[PDB]
Amino acid sequence: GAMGSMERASLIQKAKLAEQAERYEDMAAFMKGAVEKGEELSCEERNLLSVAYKNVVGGQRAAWRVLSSIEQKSNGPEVREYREKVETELQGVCDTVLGLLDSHLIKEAGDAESRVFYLKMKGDYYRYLAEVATDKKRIIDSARSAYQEAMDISKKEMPPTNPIRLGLALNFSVFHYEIANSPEEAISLAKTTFDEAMADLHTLSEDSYKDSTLIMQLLRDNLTLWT
């Protein structure tokens, strides 16, 4: 692609600069370029990839919800047309991320930390497709499958306070609540995740304790909304 002539290290440096500049579309394109070099990503590089596309799709999701709400209240073709424009661009970003994961991040990821990270992302970007889907069932089952494989590996291979495991459970629980229409499964997962992490905090350093409790607080926030 357009980044094929730039060094991998330069793409990573510029992704970090684009983050500082809040230039997340640039950040995402630089990290896409880095992935397409074909080498595995480090922990820091995986986080750069995720932060970039989360910011990009986050703006599109927020736009889509504004337009969808206007559209629903309005029910001329303009509101529908422009909602469809934004929806199509959002689906394109999701398709791009899923393509990176499938070609070939997931298959080359052998360590639990990398494989769970990528399978969580796969679940997330199928979930974002599900939010706009109206084939919705197949999309939902693809999110569930990715999340479920990530959970199984995380439960075998990672401590219950591991931040990737915690963020996976948080997002899978939200999937259950509002995509799968399984609010009891959502609440159950969030509770069990919070409680098993609480009982393992005593093993952690001050810095790891801060990392884990920050995501535990998100689980708590959702439980407060849900119960």
Binding site: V51, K54, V56, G59, L170, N171, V174, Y177, L225
Partner: peptide, 12 residues
């Protein structure tokens, strides 16, 4: 749309 907490940047 009430949005619940998910991992990483609350970008939406």
């Amino acid at each position: 749309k009430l949005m619940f907490k998910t991992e990483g940047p609350d970008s939406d």
